[PDB]
Structure formats: structure tokens, C-alpha cells
Design a protein around this ligand. Structure first.
Ligand SMILES: COc1ccc(OCCOC(=O)[C@@H]2CCCCN2S(=O)(=O)c2ccc3[nH]c(=O)sc3c2)cc1OC
Length: 128
């Protein structure tokens, strides 16, 4: 399935080149511009665990997830991954625990040492 495919065929987007965050672009977005640090970014996403459980989805809430990019408001894999996206892009990200919730997890949904899969759509980004 899609998690296996990004695991086996994704591109390493980390600066360290440690394969901690792997990406596949599913739909090419608009132009060449990616968001800047501090931008308000609007996304839709769905997240799955490695046991196949869908653990969260903004689509199911009928509202986007909004955060300021590059500020540690989200897991490291998202600060890195969303920074690579164009407006309108959809991507798959595979996030090893060192770029996610590590040994602590995030209770109640995310266990220790969890590799996370996301499908992310970048809806918009704006400077404040
Ligand atoms: C009101 O409950 C929340 C509390 C925090 C929150 O974002 C926490 C930061 O989450 C993350 O960094 C990652 C990546 C961006 C999208 C959200 N995630 S997540 O899917 O791994 C995640 C992480 C924690 C979390 N807690 C919930 O009750 S739902 C939820 C979802 C998201 C929340 O629900 C939207």
C-alpha cells in the first residue's frame, strides 16, 4: 500500500541524509514557491500508524490544520516536509520516530517508537 511504497520508493528530504523523513509527491502543486519560515500554513492531512490505524484526519473535522512553519509547533518531519511543498501539492510523508514523537509517543493514539505515515495537502500559505 501507500506506506510501503513511500518506505521503499520515497526520497530522503532530511538535511542529515539519515532517511528519517521520506517523501513522494502525489500531485504537483503550483509554480516553484514553497512557504517561508514563520508563514501561516493551511493543510489537510490524514495520519496512519504502522499497524494500519488511521489515527487522525483534518478532513473528518471539516476544517484545515493551521500552523506557523519552522517554529516547532509540529513534529520535525512536518516542519521539514511542509517546507518542501508547493501550494496545491499533495504528498506522502514517512516519518521515523526521531522526526516524530520518539520514545515518548503521544498518548493516547501514538505509541512509543512509532513510524508515522501522512498524506498532506498544502492548501495555502501566507506571511503574517
Ligand atoms: C486539539 O487536539 C490537538 C492537539 C495538538 C495537535 O497538534 C499537535 C501537533 O501535531 C503534530 O505535530 C502532528 C503533525 C501536524 C498535524 C497533527 N499531527 S498528528 O497527526 O501527529 C497529531 C498529534 C497529536 C494529536 N492529538 C490529538 O488529539 S489529534 C493529534 C494529531 C492537534 C490536535 O488536534 C488537531
Amino acid at each position: 500500500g501507500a506506506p510501503a511504497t513511500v518506505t521503499e520508493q520515497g526520497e530522503d528530504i532530511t538535511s542529515k541524509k539519515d532517511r528519517g523523513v521520506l517523501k513522494i509527491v502525489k500531485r504537483v502543486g503550483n509554480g516553484e514557491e514553497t512557504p517561508m519560515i514563520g508563514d501561516k500554513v493551511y493543510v489537510h492531512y490524514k495520519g496512519k500508524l504502522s499497524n494500519g490505524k488511521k489515527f487522525d484526519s483534518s478532513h473528518d473535522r471539516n476544517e484545515p490544520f493551521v500552523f506557523s512553519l519552522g517554529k516547532g509547533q509540529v513534529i520535525k518531519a512536518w516542519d521539514i516536509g511542509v517546507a518542501t511543498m508547493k501550494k496545491g501539492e499533495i504528498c506522502h510523508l514517512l516519518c521515523k520516530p526521531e522526526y516524530a514523537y520518539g520514545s515518548a509517543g503521544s498518548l493516547p493514539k501514538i505509541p512509543s517508537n512509532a513510524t508515522l505515515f501522512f498524506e498532506i495537502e498544502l492548501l495555502d500559505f501566507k506571511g503574517e
